[PDB]
Amino acid sequence: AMKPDIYENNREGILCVYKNEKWLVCIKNWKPDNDIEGIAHLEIHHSTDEQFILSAGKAILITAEKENDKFNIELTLMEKGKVYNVPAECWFYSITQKDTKMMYVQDSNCSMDNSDFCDLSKEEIEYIQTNARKLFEK
Amino acid sequence: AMKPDIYENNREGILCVYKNEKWLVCIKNWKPDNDIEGIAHLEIHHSTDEQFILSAGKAILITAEKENDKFNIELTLMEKGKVYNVPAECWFYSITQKDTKMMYVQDSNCSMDNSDFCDLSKEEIEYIQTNARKLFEK
């Protein structure tokens, strides 16, 4: 009998583990631009929703809207056992710790042709750091 | 700023939480036909692969091939932090405990038009129960 395919990621950051012509599934470990000290930019997908599932450790999901040239920011502490969805055209990013692991699901057309990054300002980074420090412990 | 959509399942069995025209994401809790005592049939998807992610508790993924009228059975103890894929046309089912929670991803065309169930025989159920009892503790 055939076993299931079994996927893991022991590397920094993201490893895509399953892809077909419709969706993909990635396992994401800690990487510097998700560390509380390294938060510097948000991402946006113009053409796909994305779901996130926390597996190990703690994580916060930043979501934002861009108003003029400034972000209005929300922080959501992720809970193990829940699924989070960031709809297309919503800015987002993660804050994670060295032992954090999460999985995400999105459309398999993962060219950056249909996504973008944007830098956060200095006040925005400090604002996120101040509140995320606290939120990680709540 | 918009929050992410936040999904949970506190009910028995399966709750589909995210769907689009390509994929869906479900959260599955314990239900009797996944209990070690309740294992009675396997499932097969003819047209979709499916990925499984363990969130809480313990779980075993049964995979099988059908040879004549009997199943050749494999058991895989799931690990938190890994992703498991059951390709289309592979028989499978889960064995879970009352506090188990997992998520799964498959094609959003989830009619049973393209899937089937098949009963396990008496020897097959006893065989799975004997080995799964042990495997849950390894």
CATH, residue A68: 2.60.120.10
**Strands lying side by side in the sheet with A101-107:** A14-19, A23-29, A101-107, A50-56, A83-86, B5-7
Tokens standing for residue A12 = 């920094």
Burial of B21 (0-12, 13-18, 19+ CB in 10 A): exposed
- Residues in Cβ contact with B134 at an 8 Å cutoff, skipping those fewer than 6 apart: none
Tokens standing for residue A20 = 């077909």
A19: nearest Cα among A31, A32, A7: A7
Q: Please, what's the b/e burial string for A122-137 (b: 16 or more CB within 10 A of its CB; e: otherwise)?
A: eebbeebeeebeeebe
CB within 8 Å: B85 and A7: yes
Method: X-ray
Tokens standing for residue A101 = 């692991």
Domain count, chain A: 1
Residue B123 Cα to chain centre, angstroms: 21
- Residues in Cβ contact with A30 at an 8 Å cutoff, skipping those fewer than 6 apart: A12, A13, A57, A96, A97, A98, A99, A100
Q: B26: domain range?
A: 1-138
> Touching check for B120 and chain A: CB below 8 Å?
no
CB within 8 Å: A82 and B8: yes
CB within 8 Å: B81 and A55: yes
- If one counts every other C-beta atom within 10 angstroms of the C-beta of residue A90, the result is 22
Q: At what resolution in Å was this solved?
A: 1.5
- If one counts every other C-beta atom within 10 angstroms of the C-beta of residue B119, the result is 11
Q: What does the alpha-carbon distance between residue A122 and residue A105 come to, in Å, rounded to a whole number?
A: 31
Q: What does the alpha-carbon distance between residue B96 and residue A130 come to, in Å, rounded to a whole number?
A: 41
Tokens standing for residue A8 = 């893991």
- If you ran DSSP here, which 8-state letter would residue B33 be given? G
Q: Please, what's the b/e burial string for A46-64 (b: 16 or more CB within 10 A of its CB; e: otherwise)?
A: eebbbbbbbbebbbbbbbb
